[PDB]
Ligand binder design. Structure first.
Ligand SMILES: *[C@@H]1O[C@H](CO)[C@@H](O[C@@H]2O[C@H](CO)[C@@H](O[C@@H]3O[C@H](CO)[C@@H](O)[C@H](O[C@H]4O[C@H](CO)[C@@H](O)[C@H](O)[C@@H]4O[C@H]4O[C@H](CO)[C@@H](O)[C@H](O)[C@@H]4O[C@H]4O[C@H](CO)[C@@H](O)[C@H](O)[C@@H]4O)[C@@H]3O)[C@H](O)[C@H]2NC(C)=O)[C@H](O)[C@H]1NC(C)=O
Ligand SMILES: *[C@@H]1O[C@H](CO)[C@@H](O)[C@H](O)[C@H]1NC(C)=O
Length: 686
């Protein structure tokens, strides 16, 4: 059922509206039903044909005025889209008609079908009936409002995704061969891409110098969140479509190509923009958290003037208070200075950077302060000072970020004062052998770990290491005491922090306890994290393993962190262990000069005992601290004879074949530091 707008040049398709339940509405004491670009087998059979529309009176097996033998679709005088189902020639040479108009609504897809009126010419036996059908398919390809509300009343905004300077893209290749780059836009047309322009192209595939428009910017986002772009260029008998499913997540994600269902390309987009927008203003330097319920109080940060240095300038500000420092002098009028830029001489001056304010704003889990009303910059702008507060264990000094185009001076401050109540545990332990383990690097204060489960899993798992969870984005927050959490019906506490990690039956176990009540109503849920040493897993995530009787939850985590902290050293990136013990020995070797005697990993029989190298005079004591640096193995022999302290740096370099003269060579003598630099090309370094 497809037509062209002469004003627009767009190809409209109502194809997607073929449905099976069809569409059914009341009026004039009877119910009118039909389907679109499809049949309505209920009340069918005009001749032997299945009928597109019907009529009946009810509340009914019996149909009436079956219609759909002559189907017609066209633009009227307005340039508005009309579909006519004419039925059979009853009498007097005229057929019963259904006339249905398609009216643009960006916000809905198969939007309310309302009966309008019917014209009754009894004289000519034509009972002609008139309908309106709201759809986004009627809308000409144009940019869309990118703000959404769900039925629960949570507001979102995906404008973040559309405002980017770069075009979002998902690359995807097959087992061998196929290589393609998906361009996605949100609510706005794609940026200029060679081969993809059309009218309002939302998703585009480029492969082998062929571009495909896989959906036009048509319908607004729907509520988790979804967008569909439809009416892309021909795919056999159909036209291409793209579905993007948004999911609320800690990261600023990219859209990831998931699968292809006929002519529809489906993507999953895990991003922070998809998270319910909730924002709150406070005064008296305090603000209440809408999710947890706790009160942030930043008054403690204002008990002294805060000084931050930048390049040549130096910034003074007092949190929620008047500056005490003898700079930017201004008491005149009703202006209380809270922020000052001082450019130190030369060509230095003092500029007021912000006035007193005790307003603390909370915007989607960030705390902000803006000191306004400063000295004029760029004729029209008043200098302002913004501080962004993030949760952290200790309240460290703020750091200068940048000056905006409107002379807003931006500061980040990670401080515990921005952190809800939170439990903490010692995260280093030792095994039976005395090897050191420290998982403290996996403790996250601003975010949490998202567990890896199955790809369709309706539930997500949040975990932190050796502490209770950081605050989470959304309006369904976990109980504050939880260190692990389940996110179905309600947020489920899976366990609180009690003890640190322990070597239990030859594996690293972290146990959280006293979560929500188990279904039997006598026990409380507990979580076990089983850590397994894996050098390659450097950014790894915990994999959810099992949930026994909705009571015992178990995760596994292969990670490089869980690994223990003899002339051998490990490549920190690959894990290949280089052993230089096979070269050691009191016997040792000589390097060209006069000569130089030296032994590695051990002492030499020509020098004083305990000295690694000498000539004749000690040039360094033997030692065992081997470093891997820049694909080279390195020893430093220090504390030698007096420098007219002599020292020897020995560097081992990869050589796939053992050369005809495979002995170390003195490559430098630094006279300013009395340092002897040796290089040795040996197959042992590969
Ligand atoms: C801490 O608090 C202070 C106080 O709240 C905040 O500082 C303020 O920042 C405001 C920006 O939101 C700024 O308002 C601006 O007033 C200027 C005066 O010239 C006005 O030009 C700005 O107007 C822009 O937008 C309006 C409405 O759309 C337009 O009518 C106007 O022509 C300007 O349009 C352009 O810039 C917009 C963004 O600024 C663009 O969206 C828009 O596309 C358009 O771009 C064109 O012109 C731009 C140059 O102006 C150019 O970059 C672009 O290429 C195009 O050529 C706006 O009303 C306040 O002036 C400022 N406070 C003071 C004292 O001046 C500060 O943000 C706070 N810090 C934090 C953390 O928020
Ligand atoms: C309409 O959809 C029905 C059922 O959903 C399917 O059997 C049929 O092939 C579709 N027909 C057209 C005209 O697209």
């Amino acid at each position: 059922c497809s037509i062209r707008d002469p004003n627009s040049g767009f190809v409209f398709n109502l194809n997607p509206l073929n449905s099976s339940q069809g569409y059914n509405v009341s009026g004039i004491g009877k119910i009118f039903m039909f389907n679109v670009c499809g049949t309505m087998p209920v009340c069918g059979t005009i001749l032997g044909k299945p009928a597109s529309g019907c009529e009946a009176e009810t509340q009914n097996w019996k149909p009436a005025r079956p219609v759909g033998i002559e189907k017609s679709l066209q633009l009227s005088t307005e340039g508005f889209i009309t579909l006519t189902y004419k039925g059979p020639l009853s009498a007097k040479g005229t057929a019963d008609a259904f006339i249905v108009r398609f009216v643009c609504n960006d916000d809905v897809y198969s939007g309310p079908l309302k009966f309008l009126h019917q014209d009754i010419d009894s004289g000519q036996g034509i009972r002609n009936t008139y309908f309106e059908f709201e759809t986004a398919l009627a809308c000409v390809p144009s940019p869309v409002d990118c703000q959404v509300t769900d039925l629960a009343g949570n507001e979102y905004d995906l404008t973040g995704l559309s405002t980017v300077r770069k075009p979002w893209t998902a690359v995807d290749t097959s087992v061998d061969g196929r290589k393609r780059t998906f361009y996605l836009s949100v609510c706005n047309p794609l940026p200029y891409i060679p081969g993809c322009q059309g009218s309002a192209v939302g998703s585009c595939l480029v492969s082998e110098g062929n571009s495909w428009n896989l959906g036009v910017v048509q319908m607004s986002p729907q509520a988790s969140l979804s967008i569909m772009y439809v009416n892309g260029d021909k795919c056999g008998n159909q036209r291409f479509s793209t579905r993007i499913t948004f999911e609320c997540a800690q990261i600023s994600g990219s859209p990831a190509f998931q699968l292809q269902d006929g002519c529809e390309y489906v993507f999953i987009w895990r991003t922070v923009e998809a998270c319910p927008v909730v924002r709150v203003e406070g005064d008296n330097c305090e603000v209440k958290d809408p999710r947890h319920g706790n009160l942030y109080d930043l008054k403690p940060l204002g008990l002294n003037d805060t000084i931050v240095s930048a390049g040549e300038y130096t910034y003074y500000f007092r949190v929620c208070g008047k500056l005490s420092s003898d700079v930017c002098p201004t008491s005149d009028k009703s202006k209380v200075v809270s922020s000052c830029q001082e450019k130190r001489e030369p060509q230095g001056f003092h500029k007021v950077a912000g006035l007193l304010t005790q307003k603390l704003t909370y915007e989607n889990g960030l705390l902000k302060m803006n000191f306004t009303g400063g000295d004029t910059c760029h004729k029209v702008y008043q200098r302002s000072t913004a501080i962004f507060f993030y949760c952290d264990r200790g309240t460290q000094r703020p750091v200068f970020l940048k000056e905006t185009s409107d002379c807003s001076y931006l500061f980040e401050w990670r401080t515990q004062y921005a952190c809800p109540p939170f439990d903490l545990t010692e995260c280093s332990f030792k095994d039976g052998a005395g090897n050191s383990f420290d998982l403290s690097s996996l403790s996250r204060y601003s975010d949490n770990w998202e567990a890896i489960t199955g790809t369709g899993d309706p539930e997500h798992y949040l975990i932190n290491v050796c502490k209770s969870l950081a605050p989470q984005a959304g309006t369904e927050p976990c109980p504050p005491e939880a260190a692990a959490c389940l996110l179905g019906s309600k947020p489920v506490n899976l366990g609180r922090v009690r003890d640190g990690p322990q070597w239990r039956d030859g594996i690293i176990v972290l146990k959280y306890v006293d979560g929500d009540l188990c279904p039997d109503g006598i026990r409380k849920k507990s979580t076990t994290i089983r850590f397994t040493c894996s050098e390659s897993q450097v950014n790894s995530r915990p994999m959810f393993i099992s949930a026994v009787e909705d009571c015992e939850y178990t995760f596994a985590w292969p990670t490089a962190t869980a690994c223990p902290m003899d002339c051998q050293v490990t490549n920190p990136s690959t894990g290949h262990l280089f052993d230089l013990s096979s070269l050691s020995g009191r016997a040792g070797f000589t390097a060209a000069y006069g000569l130089v005697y030296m032994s590695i990993c051990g002492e030499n029989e020509n020098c004083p005992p305990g000295v690694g190298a000498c000539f004749g005079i000690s040039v360094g004591k033997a030692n065992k601290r081997l470093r891997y640096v820049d694909q080279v193995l390195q020893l430093v022999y220090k504390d030698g004879s007096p420098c007219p302290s002599y020292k020897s740096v020995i560097s081992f370099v990869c050589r796939p074949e053992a050369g005809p003269t495979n002995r170390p060579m003195l490559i430098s003598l630094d006279k300013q530091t009395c340092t002897l630099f040796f290089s040795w090309h040996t197959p042992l370094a590969c």
